[PDB]
Amino acid sequence: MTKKRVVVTGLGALSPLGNDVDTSWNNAINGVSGIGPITRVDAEEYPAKVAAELKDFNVEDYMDKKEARKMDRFTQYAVVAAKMAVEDADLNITDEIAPRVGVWVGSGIGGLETLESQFEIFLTKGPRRVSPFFVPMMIPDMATGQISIALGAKGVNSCTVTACATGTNSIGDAFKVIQRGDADVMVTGGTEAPLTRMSFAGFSANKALSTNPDPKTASRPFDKNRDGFVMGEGAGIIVLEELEHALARGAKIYGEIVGYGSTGDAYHITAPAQDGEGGARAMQEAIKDAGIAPEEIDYINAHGTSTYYNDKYETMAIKTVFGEHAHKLAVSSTKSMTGHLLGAAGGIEAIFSILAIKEGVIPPTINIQTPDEECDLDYVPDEARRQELNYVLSNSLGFGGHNATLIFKKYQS
Amino acid sequence: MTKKRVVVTGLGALSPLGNDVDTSWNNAINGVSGIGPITRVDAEEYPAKVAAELKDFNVEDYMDKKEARKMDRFTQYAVVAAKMAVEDADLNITDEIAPRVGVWVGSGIGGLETLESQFEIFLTKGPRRVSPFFVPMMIPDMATGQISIALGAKGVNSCTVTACATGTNSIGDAFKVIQRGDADVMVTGGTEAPLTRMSFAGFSANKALSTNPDPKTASRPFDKNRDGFVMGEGAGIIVLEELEHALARGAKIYGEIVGYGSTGDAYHITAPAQDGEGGARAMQEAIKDAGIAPEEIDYINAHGTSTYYNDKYETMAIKTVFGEHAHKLAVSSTKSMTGHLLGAAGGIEAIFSILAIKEGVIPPTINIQTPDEECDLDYVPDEARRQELNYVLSNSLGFGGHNATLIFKKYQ
Ligand SMILES: [K+]
Ligand SMILES: [K+]
Ligand SMILES: [K+]
Ligand SMILES: [K+]
Incomplete structure (x- = not known):
């Protein structure tokens, strides 16, 4: 029970x-x-x-x-x-x-x-x-x-x-x-x-x-x-x-794993929904699942595939979910380094989210040379950031409208 | 929870x-x-x-x-x-x-x-x-x-x-x-x-x-x-x-859907596990999930694919799980009529399991002409059987050792 x-x-x-x-x-x-x-x-x-x-x-x-x-x-x-x-x-x-x-x-x-x-x-x-x-x-x-x-x-x-x-x-x-x-x-x-x-x-x-x-x-x-x-x-x-x-x-x-959210865009076979609404709903479901306030999220390991639509809509979804906090937390895409591993993406990114918490290090987004006005969050550019993390959220916003979010927590007795 | x-x-x-x-x-x-x-x-x-x-x-x-x-x-x-x-x-x-x-x-x-x-x-x-x-x-x-x-x-x-x-x-x-x-x-x-x-x-x-x-x-x-x-x-x-x-x-x-069981054989890429032990465990998990006694199962829509080893081993699994009741409940394979729809098999068979309960009719296994001493349960041969059903179990024992079982119940 x-x-x-x-x-x-x-x-x-x-x-x-x-x-x-x-x-x-x-x-x-x-x-x-x-x-x-x-x-x-x-x-x-x-x-x-x-x-x-x-x-x-x-x-x-x-x-x-x-x-x-x-x-x-x-x-x-x-x-x-x-x-x-x-x-x-x-x-x-x-x-x-x-x-x-x-x-x-x-x-x-x-x-x-x-x-x-x-x-x-x-x-x-x-x-x-x-x-x-x-x-x-x-x-x-x-x-x-x-x-x-x-x-x-x-x-x-x-x-x-x-x-x-x-x-x-x-x-x-x-x-x-x-x-x-x-x-x-x-x-x-x-x-x-x-x-x-x-x-x-x-x-x-x-x-x-x-x-x-x-x-x-x-x-x-x-x-x-x-x-x-x-x-x-x-x-x-x-x-x-x-x-x-x-x-x-x-x-x-x-x-510890504490939250999971799954939603569908019901929009288009390959194009992500406008303003990332489905991704926003998946993050919200995961947050509700974990029983936490959005402000408790310290770091988001983004889906961040380096397509025009994903990175823009994910930024928008993050702002929708976290409001003022969206500018306070850290976001990064490790796909800047690993590329998009498709079906394996969420596996490697879960591991990075877990080790980020365990070792107290946020991995960076590399290769951001020309800032985009529409992508104006803190993407941890260039250099890792040593920091104590309590909660980390990981997104996978897949082709076909499949939005999935996990939330990991530092283990406390 | x-x-x-x-x-x-x-x-x-x-x-x-x-x-x-x-x-x-x-x-x-x-x-x-x-x-x-x-x-x-x-x-x-x-x-x-x-x-x-x-x-x-x-x-x-x-x-x-x-x-x-x-x-x-x-x-x-x-x-x-x-x-x-x-x-x-x-x-x-x-x-x-x-x-x-x-x-x-x-x-x-x-x-x-x-x-x-x-x-x-x-x-x-x-x-x-x-x-x-x-x-x-x-x-x-x-x-x-x-x-x-x-x-x-x-x-x-x-x-x-x-x-x-x-x-x-x-x-x-x-x-x-x-x-x-x-x-x-x-x-x-x-x-x-x-x-x-x-x-x-x-x-x-x-x-x-x-x-x-x-x-x-x-x-x-x-x-x-x-x-x-x-x-x-x-x-x-x-x-x-x-x-x-x-x-x-x-x-x-x-x-109503009331039970679901999932196990793996951990045996072989295509060969089913010996004596259907993995299938037995899956049915037991579904039964435990539904919170019922095995004797409450009235009809099993078998996986029954018509391979030598599936049907033999599924029969063995049914006996393992149900004991003497294995000879009291009814079993049938609708693949005798539909063939094996692979990934769709569990879907159509879920539908047949549900309609069996709603309509009170057990669909038959057709084409059984030569009995197999090892397959000696009641397979509802040739002709449908009118019967009031309270619980129906459906198996899918897939290639690669994937065993899945659903239990359906009559609703009020
Ligand atoms: K391109
Ligand atoms: K991610
Ligand atoms: K079946
Ligand atoms: K053959």
Whole structure:
């Protein structure tokens, strides 16, 4: 009858900023860009010229080659990051607790690279040479499916697919599962491997991607000259745990998740609603969920994708929700450094929000060279800010009108 | 912790058994098969030869061609079925209630036909010929996305993608949204248009599909000679509503949703877990959620896909959970008639579970000709059964170890 408290007890990540959480976070707080020339595909025929890729990531350092060969990159990242998160949590998933340990990991795009290569085989060799592994490799739920198997996690089990809101919805949904007592632990987050021919083709065809060839200025959220997002890849996975459970086993606690809000624009298939009204409502739902006043928010990790419409409408939504306080709190987009990881965005950004609180550091928005009159909040430009944080809000305002907000709190007994 | 009661006030469906709920349901209770030769693709080079396709469905009867051209079939089905459910519910979505009306519709496969045609354009004509609408057309969340826009629904929204469990998870997740107080109305279920070249190739390559070329016997859940599933398409969408809200607007109530269980096998990417242990646990969680004794379950709408291992293991799971009662309750698989609608399966089967209670009729499992010693429960063979039902349980035991169970109850 009483809501369970839910704390963060482990973090795992692969990002363009590093192949673990520490490296990723350390790079973020020093304003290091993960954006560079596209190498994953031939960029000659695309308007987009840069991307945020994993660097020096060899999957075989983490599993047998034969296991990796039966996983699309998106699943590879999720299994690697999930194992990292569980090891960080020092959680021993035994037969006794397996039914109370679940997995809720989403992907926005799933195994598009596998679909592409398998479709080419279909065209040339026929349907009878399609791989027996094609379907399980391509479907987005196989990140959750493979993590479950790798971990022996037999509890509540799902996969949310909501475009850019994916990682944030997934964490909120997992939070709600534990809150109502249906699991003691959830391994949750987002994963994405969207650097593929069709993905670049598709996000260039609707001009969503920046065509800025200069990696030093391509991703520049809130900058007057921003012109679209820079696509990235990776996974961000956390371990959510019921508080008493965590305390009883001596878990380390990063902080507490206290609010989740989800709304829809009901407006347009790709264009965000005017003045960010849907995003404003999602922030408001999350604030009400956390039981706090808006003034208690110290820092907002913005969605901040560096498109014209997002950054402008998100600024407006923030002003609508926080009024005078909107100019008092700090806002930043770490996509200035990581690029937009799509379905994994909310996962990595949840991790940055959590570490911001734990370590008392706000990561900066880099690359703001020309201020935009319509984006006039404090975006923590250029340099990290050392500061004690009690509450941090993270937005994901995804294509398709999916608005998702999480609120994290410093852990106090 | 808020605990609202959640009732079903509207139903909408497209299935191989009919292009609305009334037709689908009436055919189901009359044991009509929706399975025939594949026409959507040329099956000559494919191992599988039959499928369960929509009959005489022309999307232009429901929207302008220009609107349909911007939707993959999976989205078309979702929008048509959702509008049918909202009209059935006689629900008027206004600015005033919009933020309290959400959408949670899943798809297991999303817009694979669009992805195939657009990628073939890429290969032959280059990336500049790829449509600006490609991404939003292909991604599974755009069923929820387009439904939201069509309805003006501004509340909690999401898309669950969990293979065969998709429709059942989606409805359960929407149930929990209303239960904790975060929406007054949810339009929820599953949609699927999986009859495509790569889908047929893929589910034949892993041997999941039946290669039985005879449509009269292809889908035969619990039969000794069952040899894989028959693929179908469509959407099953329902309107869930908080009880006091439903009463305030004079809504008609089909029944109540009371239990939801979700587990994972943690076993294998495609093979079901031994002895259905994961499915057993999911049903037990749903039963615990509803706060009832197993003996109170009157009818189970099985997942019953007609694969060897699903039907055997689901039968074993049912015995594990219900003990001696497993031989007292009724079980049936409506996939014997509809085929396996994949991500939409849980949606249509939720609808059949709800109508079973409301109408007091249990739909049969057709096509069982050879009993299987291992599948020896009461599968309501061949003919529908008139019966007063208080509780119905619906399973979806999806590929990849996703187990989902819903329990529905008769409303006052
Ligand atoms: K652009
Ligand atoms: K964020
Ligand atoms: K088979
Ligand atoms: K079922």
